[PDB]
Design a protein around this ligand. Structure first.
Ligand SMILES: NC(=O)c1ccc[n+]([C@@H]2O[C@H](COP(=O)([O-])OP(=O)(O)OC[C@H]3O[C@@H](n4cnc5c(N)ncnc54)[C@H](OP(=O)(O)O)[C@@H]3O)[C@@H](O)[C@H]2O)c1
Ligand SMILES: Nc1nc(=O)c2nc(CNc3ccc(C(=O)N[C@@H](CCC(=O)O)C(=O)O)cc3)cnc2[nH]1
Ligand SMILES: [Mn+2]
Ligand SMILES: [Mn+2]
Ligand SMILES: [Mn+2]
Length: 159
């Protein structure tokens, strides 16, 4: 099973200048809980944005060019990325925009955080078709001393 996980600001913005400008510790904790002990697939730009391997997960990086770090696994196509995960119950695709576009048609589940923040961005989550997806979990949180925007954790499953 393939799943996508992402945090979206207003208008589906996910990034700006290869960075995520906000800081929501509660959402990073949610990301960790839902990805730990699973393979994560990311594109090269997102690898560079994170800047290090994510511990406790098999890190698989898509790039058309040879890898430059043997602490992670490098693959050259979507099918190779999936194969490199092996026989696991759930593969987590962690972006960015161009990678999410390619894996969305193959995904059964979306883990989306909707952040009530306006962000100038240059990267968006794909414009998926809402009729294809059932919301099976949603949990709203107001802003607090640690998290400066309100946010909604949602899980959607392909109908
Ligand atoms: N808010 C969130 O949830 C979230 C999550 C992830 C990322 N982001 C943000 O998203 C932005 C990065 O997204 P992006 O769209 O620019 O880049 P991306 O999807 O991370 O990376 C694209 C790169 O991945 C490689 N790639 C993708 N598909 C491939 C394929 N089928 N075969 C081979 N290589 C492939 C290519 O690398 P080569 O050029 O080396 O061939 C391509 O240039 C950053 O701002 C980051 O902060 C946000
Ligand atoms: N909901 C969601 N939020 C995100 O921030 C997110 N980020 C990415 C890509 N970028 C990043 C950037 C940093 C870390 C990171 O430092 N994660 C730690 C945090 C642990 C914690 O704070 O409790 C990790 O071990 O996962 C993960 C992904 C992809 N999907 C996402 N999905
Ligand atoms: Mn092929
Ligand atoms: Mn198999
Ligand atoms: Mn806000």
């Amino acid at each position: 099973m393939i799943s996508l996980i992402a945090a979206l600001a207003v208008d589906r913005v996910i990034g700006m200048e290869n960075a995520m400008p906000w800081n929501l510790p509660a959402d990073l904790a949610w990301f960790k809980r839902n990805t730990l002990n699973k393979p994560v697939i990311m594109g090269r730009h997102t690898w560079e944005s994170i800047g290090r391997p994510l511990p406790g997960r098999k890190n698989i990086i898509l790039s058309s060019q040879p890898g430059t770090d043997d602490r992670v696994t490098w693959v050259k196509s979507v099918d190779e990325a999936i194969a490199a995960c092996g026989d696991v119950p759930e593969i987590m695709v962690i972006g960015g925009g161009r990678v999410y576009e390619q894996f969305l048609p193959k995904a059964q589940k979306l883990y989306l955080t909707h952040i009530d923040a306006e962000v100038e961005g240059d990267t968006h989550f794909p414009d998926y078709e809402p009729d294809d997806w059932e919301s099976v979990f949603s949990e709203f949180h107001d802003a607090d001393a640690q998290n400066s925007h309100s946010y909604c954790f949602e899980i959607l499953e392909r109908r």
